[PDB]
Amino acid sequence: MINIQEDKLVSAHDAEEILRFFNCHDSALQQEATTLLTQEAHLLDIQAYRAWLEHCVGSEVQYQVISRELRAASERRYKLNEAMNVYNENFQQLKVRVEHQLDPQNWGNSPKLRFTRFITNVQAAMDVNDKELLHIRSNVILHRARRGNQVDVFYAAREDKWKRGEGGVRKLVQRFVDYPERILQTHNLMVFL
Template identity: 80%
Template sequence: MMINIQEDKLVSAHDAEEFLRFLNSGDEALQQEATTLLTREAHLLDIQAYRAWLEHCVDSEVKYQIISRELRSASERRYQLNETMNIFNENYEQLEIRVAHQLDPQNWGNSPKVRFTRFITNIQAAMDENEDLLHIRSNLIVHRARRGNQVDVFYATREDKWKRGEDGARKLVQRLIDYPERTFQTHNVMIFL
């Protein structure tokens, strides 16, 4: 199955390439491994075990990006500009700083405690041509609740790359989070997606 991006003008070249990557992968063991990785990671983030998340799930060479794509109609695009905007573009050290901020007792955002529930769906897995990177695509919904009336819901698509380390465990080396809103409808973005 091919996607002709000349005919299907709404499909980007990147999306067509990613679709083909996962279409040709039918390895059930790989799919199960990907599901296990993501659900364990989600559990750590839901219970706010951020240091354990960094230690067990995130590689020291990680690239963690949240982007938003252009949402204008074709007739409004008078200029050739980038179609994506970075919301976060972080490395391991920057993630460590965000974790330290979350754990700081002076962080008023965590008093009262915030509760998270993550839903991960549409998980697709495929190996890299070199057989060293596991590509995982998933959709994510995060429900964040603080107090009785402060609720935020985040929706996103994630494209991950997980690398097996010397100890045999896979760690996240790249995460591209495609956030579908240009303007956040939430109280803040102090969250790991």
């Protein structure tokens, strides 16, 4: 539907994603994706990071969260790096982050943090070429509470690719988030969106 020449504020990337979900809808797949993501969020919320890696994250994963530099809507000449990687992790790198979370000398983890995630707006569509690959889009509100009166709330859209792996379990092979707040007001982005 979308014509980005007319819909002036829409990026080509965003228009491509609209197209993938508006066509060919499979209700059962949407339900499967909802289950997958709800279970993922549950594992993360209880800080079962090893279980998350083992049950939800594929060996070939790319887990990426970018922060895009604010540029003019009419900008057409400045062509330098548009973004930076808050996260751009392979499986090993996620594992390092998980070990860091679990280390008994991670002083910031005592007293124990409290996480609550809200996953909504789930959409799912099979990839046209890799019949093994399932595109899942979802939005997350992530609430982190610690040390009595520190409260940080994150908001984001997630563009995921999930593929069945060993044992035929669907696992995350790509997560992409373009984080919507340019200057973070949550002390850090040390949460798994």
